[PDB]
Structures are given as structure tokens and as C-alpha cells.
RNA sequence: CCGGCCGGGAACUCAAAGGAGACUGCCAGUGAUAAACUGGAGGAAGGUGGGGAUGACGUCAAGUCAUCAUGGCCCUUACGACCAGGGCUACACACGUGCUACAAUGGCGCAUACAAAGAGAAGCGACCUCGCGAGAGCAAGCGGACCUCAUAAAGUGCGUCGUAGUCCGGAUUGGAGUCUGCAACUCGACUCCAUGAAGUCGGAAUCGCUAGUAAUCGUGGAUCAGAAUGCCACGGUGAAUAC
């Protein structure tokens, strides 16, 4: 086991926090928290909708919940009466007075949310893995997508012995820290187990 | 006289901040003495990076509390009502302390 | 020293004798960091060495150190090899250290006073150190 | 008139000034051989003035803190030739060659994991 | 040692020990709390400590008194 | 020179010649000498006789050797006739003060055995 | 880490704030040098875990009980996962 | 009021943001006129300047089902749950990693100088009074370049000790206590008085370190009500040697 999360090395470099909040040591931990309690409940309640960031932050006493997501149609449905149900409830949930953005994540098969939530859903499925990876890859690398590589793991196709079987297309600097390296990972569950896809996206150089 | 002072984990987004409040306040009422910067606060967590054993791999990390402070002199009635309600910032802890 | 041939560091010489040769026996002679009081022992011993030789300072010194110098040292073969000056003056100075923490007098100023007045008249235990070197080299003197 | 070098090393920093003069040297308000002179190597802060001498030339208000003795005392001195912009650039051709006007950029190495300082790894058993 | 205000016993061994002299010495005292500063009161009674499994009796003597219950019954068996 | 016992100590200050008393360490050995008047780096030769029993004087005021030492048996037999846990411990022969005896245990348990 | 020992912390923690911190004014203030009688010292017979010195500092998420960062109020493993992802404010890798 | 203490000054240290800087860029020589190497100047730095982060495809069916998630199997008036006491601290032994030592380059007493980095509200807690001390009482200031933790210690200058198991060493043990905590018996930490082992440089063997390094000296932090000789950091002094 040996490699860094390319988010997390390029934290200050070129990628961005999900969370954007200043808080002293009081409430630290009890606005991450709140922060965990949002992210699962709005992560479950739009498993359908794609959804591929959200973005908390906190101004003045207010979170401020910005759903990147894929479908953002389907997230405010007909007239809006699912966004000021989300935000209802995550205002119940963080005790503050929500408000709740939308931010349409075009070009879906770019982001590695939406790439790894789709391979892991066709897992589920019961597809072969190979059509999977190797359309994933396709058609991220037919939109810019200067690198991509996906690399799923663990008792493929229902074995007794587990594999890994990564595939890749152009250049994925990994090491590179100007790297748009956009990285992201999902679990299916699906009847021998868990089977784990990673997948990472080269956008650009800075 | 009327110190106000920034604190932001971002430096580009403090010292953003304290250029809007700084014109702001300048703009408005008078002799506000500049964006005086007052020690990065890094605190530093060391953690297993480990399931298990193996004490000797650790992940070492840092959040780096940016200060500014200001200290606006004179008291006009037009920039204590032209300061308030006006700081488009998100991840800025202000006071506005007198 | 596999590949990397190196430089050498520069060394300060001694505040009292402006003198790089006695500031590394200073720096032989210290033990923990502790300069000071490495060069109060030098001092102290050197002075009583200079009143009792009546000589002089360094030159009493130098002396005492030029009769311990090494001339030679050494299937498994003990060959003898010529010592190069650095090396020759510092394995003195080694000896000559060494030999004094071996001594049972007081003070350390005055164990290495005695192994230097020792050494004066070559009869310590550094010039043995020396005569041992020279007769391990001496009877191997056939492989060159 | 007065003349200012900068002058520090490891984790230190002196302050130093220079009026023509005496020969005498005022440290933290305090002489020489009180600051530190009556420890070790007092000579280094007066190495800069024995390239050209410094017998009745000039005066040095300095104040250095920071650091140890060995730390300050080297802060001096590289703050004395740093402030020997009192007379040209001819002092820094010899004063370059003593190996003066080189800031001593050895610091201490920090620690690190797995080891008890900052090269000392742990001893290791059997194999 | 401890405490430089009063020593420590539980209340329920406090109500059991001034019951326990007033009534006479009847019977051993079932105790768990092993926390307990024998008192000079207690003189007399055989208080059985419990050491996690066994309740051992202890019949207490004059000199018992600055001291905890469970010294007098030991946890450990080594043989 | 013969003080508080058959204690005969001499030819050393007298803080720390009286520190061969049974029962007083430098402290209370401050305490003698200061109770006495006495400076603190004399000796016992170059010290009257008037100024010896002063100082037998001040060290008769503290439990020293022969009561001493059986007050301290006394404190160990009551603890090991009572058989608390100080006592079976202190019967047995292994630490009191709750330390380690898996390894350790060397001063009060002795050289190892096979 | 076992549902019963979470349910049993957020026990420890309801009866911490009620009981103490208003009667752990007894444990501050009448055991002190003003008399006397042997009585708060037997007033202790609240229910144990309102003592505030057996809350363990579980894990916010996972409530393991080991590895806890007051600061974050997680574990060092979510710490870690949380803090790759970026959901932790302004904390990233630190090298000097 | 001799203290940046005040008015004041923004030079300087410094703080933190933005830039410049180092690239074999220049020179000489050697080299396929190539890559480059060796040496020199300038420069704070010279040749990936120092350190860190960054750990390729894979190997060990390496570690973790006890952080978590999870397929299957299994218990489901029990292999689930609540409680008190105990244990994880046991001790003929053996091994690992550390600390403290065996001393005079030191021990002790008195005076005196020079740090860096941190933490702090159910918290850090001055001053002053009491206690030999751990601490206690009243209690300012500080959510903090402002206050507190907090005196750096080795160093230096005097005096003493004088090669002794000693004024080394502090284990062990008795007594008396302080604090935290419902509660220090099993089973804390610290203090005071007393005790004063083993140990005089370590067999075979073995380990770390190439320069602000090893060595040595202190300080801080996380976990934490209280509990570090560990861990993670910080600075002080500061080597030897590389044919």
C-alpha cells in the first residue's frame, strides 16, 4: 500500500477544499461533524440525481451546501420543491438556517465521481468489468481528458482470488504536482463483495 | 481605536478580505493604519497513517491560521455603518472589537 | 568515499596560540560538545607543561608530539604503509589523549601534563603506543 | 556618520553599528568581556577587525539576540563585515577571502519519524 | 497515601457496620467495597472482601484501622 | 568522636562525618550542625569537646540508630502479622511498591536463580 | 465499535451534564476548609457516571476509542480519510 | 520615576504578503568540434546548495474481518445487554528497545549569561500570603506577536570534595504527606525525612552516525481529570574520520 491521494497532495497547489469554513477550536469538531451528518444524508437522499461534490461552507452563523452535481434537473425536480425540501432538512440537521446551490457538473464522464459511481453501478449490475473499464476509458478520453486511468480491484467477475486488471490512456502524471489530476473512488457492493474503482482523470498541466 | 482583526485559513483569501475592508473603511471614513500581518499560527498533527501496526509510517499535516489586523482610527458614523453588513467572505473570522 | 572524494572543513585555530594543530587536539581531547571545557584542560595542562619544560608553549608541545608521531603503520596480510603528515600528527595526537584518560594522576591538566612531559623524554606510554606500531611494521617490513 | 550590518547565524540576529572612533565595543549595553568574554572565543567577533586594524578606528554599538554564545558571537561577526560598508568594496575583496562574508547557513537539521533525532536511527535487533 | 479530608468508606458499609455493632457481631458482611477505610467501629466485625470471585472473611483487628479493606484480601493467586 | 552510638567517624566536615549516624542523612545533618552553632565544613579534629557534646546534645532529639532500626523491624513485623498485601509482599520477598516483577524486580528479589 | 459501547458513552454523557456541574459544586466547595461533618463526602451516591472522568473520547464517527484528536474529535483514521478528501478546512500536508 | 518607561520615530531586528536570486549563466582546460567533467571568478548560496513532501510495474496468497465497510459461515432467553468486584500491573525465568549510572572533562553549595518552538476557557492561571517542599488561599490578565504555562540547562566565576564504593550512584524499604479523581488496597503521580543495593566501563557478539551530523544539554506538545525514562517537535554547545 503506497501511493498518496492525489487530492490531497495538491490541496494547496491547484485543487480546492470541499469545506471553506474558519472555526476556532470550540466548534471545530462539532462543524466537521455537522459537515459528515450533511455529506451522508445528502449523498444518500441524491443517489439517483449524480451528484459529484459538495461544497460546504460557512458563512456568519448559515452553511451554504453547493451540489455539484450531473442532472441538475432531477436534483430540483418540477418547481423547485426538492431543493427547499434538502434544505429544510439540512437545516434541521446542522441547526443553522440553510441555503443550497446547484452547480450543473457538465461533461459527466470527466468527473471521477461520476465515473467511478458509474462503472461501480454497472458492477452491481452484473456486467463484465472489462465493457465497463474500457468505456469508461473511451469515452472520457473522447472529451479532452489528456490522461485517464481506472483501475478496479477484488474478486472480478466472482472469483475465489481477487485481481486489480487497471487500465490507462494517455499521460497521467502523478507525481506532478501542477497536475489537474482530478481522483476520486467508489465501493460496489455487489453479491461476492466489495469491489473497489478507482479512477483518475488528467485534465491539465496547471 | 477600532481594531479589527482577520483571521482565515487562506492567505489569498485574508489578504483579499483585508484589502476590501481596508478600502472600504478608507474609502468611506479616514486613517486606517494598514493590514498588519501578526504571526501564522501552524498547529501540526502527526497520525498514524496505519490500520494496525507501524508506528513508523505517519502522515504529517498542519492548519496554518493567517492573522491580520487593521486598527481603523477615527470614529466616523459613515464607516461604522458603511463597515457593517459588508464583507462577501466565507472562510473569514472577523472582530470588530473597539 | 565509495565515489564522493571530498574536501576538508576548516578549522578555527586556538584563541590563545593562534595555532590550528593545538585546536585539533582540542577537539580530540572534547568529549559531549563540551569545547570549553576541553580547552581549559588544554590550557591549564600546556601551561604547567611550558613552566615545568621552561621551554616554551608549543614548541614544548611540539616536542612532546614529535617524539609519538608514527613513522609506519600496518589471505590476511598486516602490510606496513607510510603515513601520510595528517594522518601522522593526528594519531599522535589520538595517543597522546588516549594514553592521558589512561593515567591515574588528579586532574585531566595534570594526567596529560605528565603524558606530554612524558612524551618529552619519550619514556610514556603514547612513545610505547608508538614503538608497538613501529614493531608491528617493522617485523612485517617484507611485504611492499 | 554610522554604518549598519544585519549580520546572523543559526537562530540568531546582531544588530551591528559602526561610528569612527575608539577601539571599544558596546554589546546589549554591555562591554565585551562581560557579554561573553568571559567565555569561549571572545577572538570572533574581533576577527573582522584584524584585517585592517581596528586599534583607535572606530566604534561599535551592536545588540544581538538570539541563539547561544557560539551563535551570537558568529552573528557578530559576520554583522561586523556586513557593516564594513564604511569603507568600500576593497575590505570585501580580503574580507571575502578570510570567508567572512558568507552567512553560515548551517541550521539544525530538524526530526524526523521513526528516528530519535534528527539522523540517530533506533538500534535494530538480531536481524 | 491519600485524602487530606477524611478518609474514605462507601454508605452502604457505613449503615451495615453501625447496624452490624448495634445488633452484635451476627454474621460476615457481604462487601464488594474493597475502596474502604476501616474504621475504629469496625473492631471486631468479620467482614468477608470480596476478591473477584471470592468473598474471604476478615476479622478485624486493632491495628487494621488505618488501612483499605482489600489489603486483607488478596486477588492473586501464586503459588 | 564517639557520638550517638559507637559511631566513630573523623578526618572529613563535619556535615557528612555525621551523616555516618544511623538515621540522619544531609538535613537533618544541616539541622545538627546549624542547632548547634556549628560551621559546616569543620572537622572533628579541630573541634572541642564542649562543642562534641553540644552536637551529642542535638542528635540525641531524633530516633537514631539502635531505636531506629527496631522501629523500622517493628513497622515491618506489624505489617507482615497482619498479612495485608504490604506484608505478603513483604513476606514473600518481592516488590511493595507496586512495580513490576514479570522483569525487574532485582534489587528486592535478589541475583538470578538457575 | 460495538453499538452498546456508543449507546453506553452517550449514557456517561447525558448523566455528566445533569447531575454534575451542579452538583459537582459539592466536590468544589464544601470540601474545603470551612468546618466538620462527614456528609457531601457521602453525598456520593450520584450514579457513578456522572462523573465527567469516564467519558472515553470515542471517535465522532467510528467511535473507536484509541488514536483521538480532541481537535477534530475523530480518530486518526478518519482524520486521514477526511482530511485526503478535503473536507477538513485548511489542514493539508505539512514538510518543513 | 532609567525599565521602550513615555512623547515619538519608522531606519533596524522582526512579523507576513509580494518580488529578485542559482540556470553549468560567465571564463580557462580536457572531451566525438557532443554530452559532460575538472578548476576559476562573481555571489548569501555552485553545481540535484541543506532538509522534507513526493515512494514506478510488481514481490511477500506480508499486516489488519478489532477503526471502518464487507461475501459466506455461526450465536440470536445467547457468542446479545446492564451492573459491582477482579484482571489486563500476576513472576523460578529468557529476549527486545530505552533511562540512570559506575564519576574529578565530575559531585555539591553560592552567584551569573545566552534560546527556539509550542499550548491555553470544564483551560493557562500572574502578583501577594501561608507551607522545608509537593502544594494551599485570595485571585489579576489572557481565547491570546499583549497574559499565563515559563526559571532554559549544559556554560561561566568562586569555594569544597579528593580517588574513597567515596560528598559517585540512586535502586529498595520504613515513616510523614500534597494533588487529581465517587474512589490511589490490588493499581497513580509528586514531595519531605530516613535507608542507601547492584554497579569501578561491561564475554561471545552487536548497533547508529559523513556536518550543525554523531555526542551531549535542556524546552514544548498530542493522548490526558490524574498518570511518560515512550512518541512527535524545538532549540544550546558541538566533534572525529573517510587511504
Redesign the interface.
Known sequence: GQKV?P???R??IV?????????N?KE???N??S??KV?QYLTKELAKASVSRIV?ERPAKSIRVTIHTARPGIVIGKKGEDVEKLRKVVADIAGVPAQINIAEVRKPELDAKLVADSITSQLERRVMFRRAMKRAVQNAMRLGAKGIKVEVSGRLGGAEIARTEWYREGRVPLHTLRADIDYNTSEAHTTYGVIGVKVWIFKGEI | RIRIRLKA??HRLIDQATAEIVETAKRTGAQVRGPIPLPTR????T???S?HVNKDAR???????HLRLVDIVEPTEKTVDALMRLDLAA?VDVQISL | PRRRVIGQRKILPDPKFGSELLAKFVNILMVDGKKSTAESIVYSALETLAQRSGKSELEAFEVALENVRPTVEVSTYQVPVEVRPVRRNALAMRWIVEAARKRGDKSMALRLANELSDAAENKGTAVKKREDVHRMAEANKAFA | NQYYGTGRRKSSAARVFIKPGNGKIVINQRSLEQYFGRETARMVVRQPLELVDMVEKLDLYITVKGGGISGQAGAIRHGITRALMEYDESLRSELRKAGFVTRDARQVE?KKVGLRKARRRPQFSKR | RSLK??P?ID?HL?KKVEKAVESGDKKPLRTWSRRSTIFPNMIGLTIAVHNGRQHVPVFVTDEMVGHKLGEFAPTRTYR | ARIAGINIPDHKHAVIALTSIYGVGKTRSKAILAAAGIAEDVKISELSEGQIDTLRDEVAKFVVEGDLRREISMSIKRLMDLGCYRGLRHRRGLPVRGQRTKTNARTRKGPRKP | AKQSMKAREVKRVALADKYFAKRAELKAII?DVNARW?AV??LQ?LPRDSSPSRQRNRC??TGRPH?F??????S??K??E???????????????
Open positions: 491521494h487530492n490531497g497532495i490541496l494547496g485543487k480546492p477544499w470541499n469545506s471553506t469554513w474558519f472555526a477550536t471545530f469538531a462539532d466537521l461533524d459537515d459528515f455529506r460546504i | 485559513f487562506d501552524k498547529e501540526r498533527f497520525v498514524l497513517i490500520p502522515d504529517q499535516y498542519e492548519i496554518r491560521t472562510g | 530538524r | 479530608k477524611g474514605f454508605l457505613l | 470540601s462527614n463526602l457521602k451516591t465522532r464517527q488514536g484528536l480532541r481537535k477534530f474529535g475523530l486518526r483514521i482524520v486521514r477526511a482530511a485526503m478528501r478535503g473536507e477538513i478546512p485548511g489542514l493539508k500536508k505539512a514538510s518543513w
